[PDB]
């Protein structure tokens, strides 16, 4: 299956609700009476049409094993359906908090690698993820991690900056240029990927658990960073720590992070 563009609403049966996302409710559904799917239902007003028509006509076409696969959309009226593949083990954040104590460190590293592979593919198409966190990743039957990116991408040419105006996502995953200068760079999601790595090896603990957004911004500016997770070796902490450099120009690309993690795999 592949992104087919527009789909027929009558060919999508809704079975159960998976939860309320950021832009609307997501329901379990059967597509063509054969395929299991997840269906984002966007009420009118809950989403920019410009963003939707840009994402639908460029991002959604990008198919990769580590990105949630888009099958199509129903956009003739509201509520607009965004139909993606269903992921059998659900949200990575929930999975870490429920089954993380039984995962080996090599599996935790494998999750970070999966996310890095998918993000390296978006990076090669000059797209950044504006909210790269464990809450936007999904775990399939093989414990392979897929990145969900709907309504969270933004076209950024390499080494360039763009305005961060738009949906305000949690600042505990945002880089200095975002919360200080209101700009994204082509490596703002690299910073967030370091926070994701911290989530994974912390088994879903909240970063800066005891501190508010105002306190985190202040202390990140002062050089303070997240600590080495209990399950992370010195080398693995060195990787995620490098994502947290103040200057975007001194952060690595997902391709460079891809080559740093490969030697550490099982």
Q: Where in the sequence is the domain holding 209, given as residue range(s)?
A: 87-266
Non-local (6+) Cβ contacts of 162 within 8 A are 154, 155, 156, 183, 184
**CATH classification of the domain holding 146:** 1.10.510.10
Q: Are residues 125 and 225 in the same domain?
A: yes
DSSP 3-state of 80 = strand
Sign of CA dihedral 193, 197, 202, 203: positive
Please count the residues of the chain.
266
- Nearest-angstrom CA–CA distance, 39 and 84: 7
Nearest to 18 by CA among 78, 71, 89: 89
Residue 150 CA: distances (Å) to CA of 60, 83, 205, 240 = 8, 11, 24, 25
Catalytic hit among 36, 50, 114, 131: 131
Residue 204 CA: distances (Å) to CA of 31, 82, 109, 168, 260 = 32, 27, 14, 22, 23
Joined together, the tokens standing for residue 36 give 């299991």
Joined together, the tokens standing for residue 142 give 């093989």
Of 86, 109, 125, which one is at a domain's C-terminal end? 86
Q: Is there a contact between 261 and 239 (Cβ–Cβ < 8 Å)?
A: yes
Q: Provide the domain count of the chain.
A: 2
Q: Are residues 112 and 196 in the same domain?
A: yes
Q: Are residues 57 and 12 in the same domain?
A: yes
The number of helices, as runs of H, and strands, as runs of E, in the chain is 8, 11
- Nearest-angstrom CA–CA distance, 195 and 78: 35
Q: Are residues 138 and 263 in the same domain?
A: yes
| Distant-in-sequence contacts of 212-221, Cβ < 8 A, 24+ apart | 213/170, 213/171, 213/172, 216/171, 216/172, 217/171, 217/179, 217/180, 220/176, 221/176, 221/180
Q: Are residues 47 and 155 in the same domain?
A: no
Resolution expressed in Å: 2.0
Chain breaks in the chain (C to N over 2.5 A) after: none
Q: Are residues 241 and 224 in the same domain?
A: yes
End-to-end CA distance of the chain: 30
Prior bond of 79 cis (ω within 30°) = yes
Q: Are residues 77 and 107 in the same domain?
A: no
Q: Is there a contact between 184 and 155 (Cβ–Cβ < 8 Å)?
A: no
Q: Are residues 191 and 65 in the same domain?
A: no
- Hey, how many other C-beta atoms are within 10 angstroms of the C-beta on 128? 23
**CATH classification of the domain holding 10:** 3.30.200.20
Q: Are residues 15 and 144 in the same domain?
A: no
In the annotation, is 131 catalytic? Answer: yes
Q: Are residues 29 and 53 in the same domain?
A: yes
Q: Which letter does DSSP use for residue 77 in this model?
A: S
Q: Are residues 225 and 137 in the same domain?
A: yes
Q: Is there a contact between 39 and 26 (Cβ–Cβ < 8 Å)?
A: yes
- Nearest-angstrom CA–CA distance, 264 and 266: 7
Of 66, 86, 106, which one is at a domain's C-terminal end? 86
Q: Are residues 103 and 38 in the same domain?
A: no
- Nearest-angstrom CA–CA distance, 82 and 53: 12
Of 86, 117, 150, which one is at a domain's C-terminal end? 86
Burial 49-88 (b: 16+ CB within 10 A, else e): eebbeebbeebbebebebbbbbbbbbbeeebbbbbbbbbe
């Amino acid at each position: 299956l592949y992104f087919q563009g527009e789909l027929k609403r009558e060919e999508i049966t809704l079975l159960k609700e998976l939860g309320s996302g950021q832009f609307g409710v997501v329901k379990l559904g059967k597509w063509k009476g054969q395929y299991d799917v997840a269906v984002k239902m966007i009420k009118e007003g809950s989403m920019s049409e410009d963003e939707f028509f840009q994402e639908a006509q460029t991002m959604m076409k990008l198919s990769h094993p580590k990105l949630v696969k888009f099958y199509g959309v129903c956009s003739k009226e509201y509520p607009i359906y965004i139909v993606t593949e269903y992921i059998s083990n659900g949200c990575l954040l929930n999975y870490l908090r429920s089954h993380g104590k039984g995962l080996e460190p090599s599996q935790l590293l494998e999750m970070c690698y999966d996310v890095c592979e998918g993000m390296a593919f978006l990076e090669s198409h000059q797209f950044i993820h504006r909210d790269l966190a464990a809450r936007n990743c999904l775990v399939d039957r093989d414990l392979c991690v897929k990145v969900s990116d709907f309504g969270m991408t933004r076209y950024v040419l390499d080494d360039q900056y763009v305005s961060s105006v738009g949906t305000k996502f949690p600042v505990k995953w945002s880089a200095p240029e975002v919360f200080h200068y209101f700009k994204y760079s082509s490596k703002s999601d690299v910073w967030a990927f370091g926070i994701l790595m911290w989530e994974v090896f912390s088994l879903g603990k909240m970063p800066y658990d005891l501190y508010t957004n105002s306190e985190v911004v202040l202390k990140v500016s002062q050089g303070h960073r997240l600590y080495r997770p209990h399950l992370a070796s010195d080398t693995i902490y060195q990787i995620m720590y490098s994502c947290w450099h103040e200057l975007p120009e001194k952060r690595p690309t997902f391709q460079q992070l891809l080559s740093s993690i490969e030697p550490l795999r099982e």
